[PDB]
Design an enzyme around this catalytic site. Structure first.
Site, PDB file in Angstrom:
ATOM      1  N   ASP A 142      40.781   9.953 -56.899  1.00  0.00           N
ATOM      2  CA  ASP A 142      41.640   9.959 -55.717  1.00  0.00           C
ATOM      3  C   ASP A 142      41.475  11.265 -54.951  1.00  0.00           C
ATOM      4  O   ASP A 142      42.444  11.832 -54.432  1.00  0.00           O
ATOM      5  CB  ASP A 142      43.110   9.738 -56.082  1.00  0.00           C
ATOM      6  CG  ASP A 142      43.937   9.280 -54.899  1.00  0.00           C
ATOM      7  OD1 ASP A 142      43.348   9.055 -53.821  1.00  0.00           O
ATOM      8  OD2 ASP A 142      45.170   9.150 -55.041  1.00  0.00           O
ATOM      9  N   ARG A 146      45.090  14.903 -49.049  1.00  0.00           N
ATOM     10  CA  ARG A 146      46.457  14.808 -49.540  1.00  0.00           C
ATOM     11  C   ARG A 146      46.591  15.232 -50.993  1.00  0.00           C
ATOM     12  O   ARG A 146      47.709  15.503 -51.438  1.00  0.00           O
ATOM     13  CB  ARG A 146      46.967  13.383 -49.380  1.00  0.00           C
ATOM     14  CG  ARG A 146      46.252  12.402 -50.261  1.00  0.00           C
ATOM     15  CD  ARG A 146      46.667  10.970 -49.986  1.00  0.00           C
ATOM     16  NE  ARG A 146      45.767  10.051 -50.668  1.00  0.00           N
ATOM     17  CZ  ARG A 146      44.688   9.522 -50.106  1.00  0.00           C
ATOM     18  NH1 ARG A 146      44.379   9.818 -48.851  1.00  0.00           N
ATOM     19  NH2 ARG A 146      43.919   8.699 -50.798  1.00  0.00           N
ATOM     20  N   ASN A 147      45.489  15.285 -51.737  1.00  0.00           N
ATOM     21  CA  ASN A 147      45.488  15.736 -53.122  1.00  0.00           C
ATOM     22  C   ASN A 147      44.824  17.100 -53.269  1.00  0.00           C
ATOM     23  O   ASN A 147      44.285  17.425 -54.328  1.00  0.00           O
ATOM     24  CB  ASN A 147      44.817  14.698 -54.022  1.00  0.00           C
ATOM     25  CG  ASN A 147      45.742  13.545 -54.349  1.00  0.00           C
ATOM     26  OD1 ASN A 147      46.938  13.737 -54.556  1.00  0.00           O
ATOM     27  ND2 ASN A 147      45.190  12.336 -54.400  1.00  0.00           N
ATOM     28  N   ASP A 160      46.499  16.025 -58.340  1.00  0.00           N
ATOM     29  CA  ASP A 160      46.698  14.581 -58.299  1.00  0.00           C
ATOM     30  C   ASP A 160      48.185  14.334 -58.478  1.00  0.00           C
ATOM     31  O   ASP A 160      48.726  14.594 -59.557  1.00  0.00           O
ATOM     32  CB  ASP A 160      45.888  13.865 -59.389  1.00  0.00           C
ATOM     33  CG  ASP A 160      45.860  12.356 -59.206  1.00  0.00           C
ATOM     34  OD1 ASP A 160      46.595  11.846 -58.332  1.00  0.00           O
ATOM     35  OD2 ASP A 160      45.092  11.679 -59.918  1.00  0.00           O
TER      36      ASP A 160
HETATM   37  C1  LIG Z   1      40.270  14.136 -65.058  1.00  0.00           C
HETATM   38  C2  LIG Z   1      41.245  13.681 -63.973  1.00  0.00           C
HETATM   39  C3  LIG Z   1      42.540  14.499 -63.907  1.00  0.00           C
HETATM   40  O1  LIG Z   1      42.881  15.185 -64.811  1.00  0.00           O
HETATM   41  N1  LIG Z   1      43.330  14.404 -62.690  1.00  0.00           N
HETATM   42  C4  LIG Z   1      44.583  15.100 -62.518  1.00  0.00           C
HETATM   43  C5  LIG Z   1      45.729  14.426 -62.907  1.00  0.00           C
HETATM   44  C6  LIG Z   1      46.968  15.023 -62.768  1.00  0.00           C
HETATM   45  C7  LIG Z   1      47.066  16.297 -62.238  1.00  0.00           C
HETATM   46  N2  LIG Z   1      48.396  16.876 -62.114  1.00  0.00           N
HETATM   47  C8  LIG Z   1      48.845  17.576 -60.914  1.00  0.00           C
HETATM   48  O2  LIG Z   1      48.148  17.722 -59.969  1.00  0.00           O
HETATM   49  C9  LIG Z   1      50.269  18.128 -60.873  1.00  0.00           C
HETATM   50  C10 LIG Z   1      51.166  17.919 -61.910  1.00  0.00           C
HETATM   51  C11 LIG Z   1      52.453  18.431 -61.810  1.00  0.00           C
HETATM   52  C12 LIG Z   1      52.822  19.137 -60.670  1.00  0.00           C
HETATM   53  C13 LIG Z   1      54.226  19.716 -60.529  1.00  0.00           C
HETATM   54  C14 LIG Z   1      51.916  19.325 -59.650  1.00  0.00           C
HETATM   55  C15 LIG Z   1      52.308  20.089 -58.385  1.00  0.00           C
HETATM   56  C16 LIG Z   1      52.572  20.701 -57.401  1.00  0.00           C
HETATM   57  C17 LIG Z   1      52.854  21.622 -56.221  1.00  0.00           C
HETATM   58  C18 LIG Z   1      52.725  22.997 -56.284  1.00  0.00           C
HETATM   59  N3  LIG Z   1      53.070  23.461 -55.092  1.00  0.00           N
HETATM   60  C19 LIG Z   1      53.412  22.406 -54.301  1.00  0.00           C
HETATM   61  C20 LIG Z   1      53.848  22.421 -52.933  1.00  0.00           C
HETATM   62  C21 LIG Z   1      54.151  21.169 -52.337  1.00  0.00           C
HETATM   63  C22 LIG Z   1      53.997  20.007 -53.132  1.00  0.00           C
HETATM   64  N4  LIG Z   1      53.589  20.089 -54.383  1.00  0.00           N
HETATM   65  N5  LIG Z   1      53.293  21.301 -54.961  1.00  0.00           N
HETATM   66  C23 LIG Z   1      50.636  18.824 -59.735  1.00  0.00           C
HETATM   67  C24 LIG Z   1      45.927  16.978 -61.842  1.00  0.00           C
HETATM   68  C25 LIG Z   1      44.675  16.378 -61.982  1.00  0.00           C
HETATM   69  C26 LIG Z   1      43.422  17.136 -61.541  1.00  0.00           C
HETATM   70  F1  LIG Z   1      42.772  16.415 -60.583  1.00  0.00           F
HETATM   71  F2  LIG Z   1      43.759  18.357 -61.031  1.00  0.00           F
HETATM   72  F3  LIG Z   1      42.602  17.321 -62.611  1.00  0.00           F
END
Ligand SMILES: *CCC(=O)Nc1ccc(NC(=O)c2ccc(C)c(C#Cc3cnc4cccnn34)c2)cc1C(F)(F)F
Length: 282
Positions: A142, A146-147, A160
């Protein structure tokens, strides 16, 4: 791992930054999460009461995957977590500027401020981040503006939102089968043949570059995702050059949109190419 655990009474929860049907990311403050920064602003992903067990399992696995990626400058910075005696909290360092789409929109009118060099830097940093994720055998699936978050010093942080985005009421996600998909960002082999690789991420990166150098435009503007759209993509249709793309930057996008995945450039090679477009050399 218990090293990540953080007590709940040390975490203040604030306004919602984003929410889906069953997850949300809230702004917050963490006390004692670092010895050097005892009062630090964070973002926290958590489930809503609505969420079922399937969505709770996904949050624990997301935390597990994030712990095993390790840190990189251009990925959101995992700081800690709350797992025992309560619902799962995933604590990440707050990125000052928020998501890249809204940042680009806010700076579109004063664009020369925001400069072409800043756009090139975002382009380079994303590629370095995606290179890191690929090295960990993580396929993003994704990748989109936006990500991508922006921290101070204008540092890209790939993220993400996952459950914390309402993909059912977001026009960027099109209903297909059982779920909603970011079709306009997807490679043909992902849409039609359900193949998801780093090379499909490279296609999405090209779409992301179009987002950047159009200053936050919607890809394939005016075009609904329908059978007419699907057939154009299979027939080799590609977006024209955004207003603020140079020829060199457009060529990079077109390379990312090769119908044959093996001919798209690596995220590492993409980093080098964008580096030569930037002034100065390290
Ligand atoms: C191998 C694929 C993979 O791991 N993808 C993945 C999956 C999940 C994430 N998690 C996040 O991006 C994430 C988790 C929890 C939080 C709180 C946040 C955030 C935030 C944030 C910080 N500052 C702001 C300001 C406005 C809005 N949101 N904010 C993110 C990541 C990944 C990755 F692709 F990175 F690997």
């Amino acid at each position: 791992d218990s090293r990540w655990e953080f007590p709940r009474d040390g975490l203040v929860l604030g306004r919602v930054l984003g929410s889906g049907a069953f997850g949300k990311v809230v702004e917050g403050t963490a006390y004692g999460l670092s010895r050097s920064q005892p009062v630090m602003k964070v973002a926290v992903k958590m489930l809503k009461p609505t969420a079922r067990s399937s969505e709770k399992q996904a949050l624990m696995s997301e935390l597990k995957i994030m712990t095993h990626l390790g840190p990189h400058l251009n990925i959101v910075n995992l700081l800690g977590a709350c797992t025992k005696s309560g619902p799962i909290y995933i604590i990440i360092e707050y990125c000052f500027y928020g998501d890249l789409v809204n940042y680009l929109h806010k700076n579109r009118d004063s664009f020369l401020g925001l400069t072409l060099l800043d756009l090139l830097s975002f382009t380079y940093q994303v590629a370095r981040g995606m290179e890191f994720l690929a090295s960990k055998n993580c396929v993003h699936r994704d990748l989109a503006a936006r990500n991508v978050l922006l921290a101070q010093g204008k540092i890209v942080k790939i993220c993400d939102f996952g459950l914390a985005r309402d993909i059912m009421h977001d026009s960027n996600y099109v209903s297909k089968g059982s779920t909603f998909l970011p079709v306009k960002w997807m490679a043909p082999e992902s849409i039609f043949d359900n193949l998801y690789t780093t090379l499909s991420d490279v296609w999405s990166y090209g779409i992301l570059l179009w987002e950047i150098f159009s200053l936050g435009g919607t890809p394939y503007p005016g075009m609904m995702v329908d059978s007419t759209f699907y057939n154009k993509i299979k027939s080799g249709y590609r977006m024209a050059k955004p207003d603020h793309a140079t020829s060199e930057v457009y060529e990079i996008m077109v390379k990312c949109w090769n119908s044959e995945p093996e001919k798209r450039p690596s995220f590492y090679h993409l980093s080098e190419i964008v580096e030569n477009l930037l002034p100065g050399q390290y």
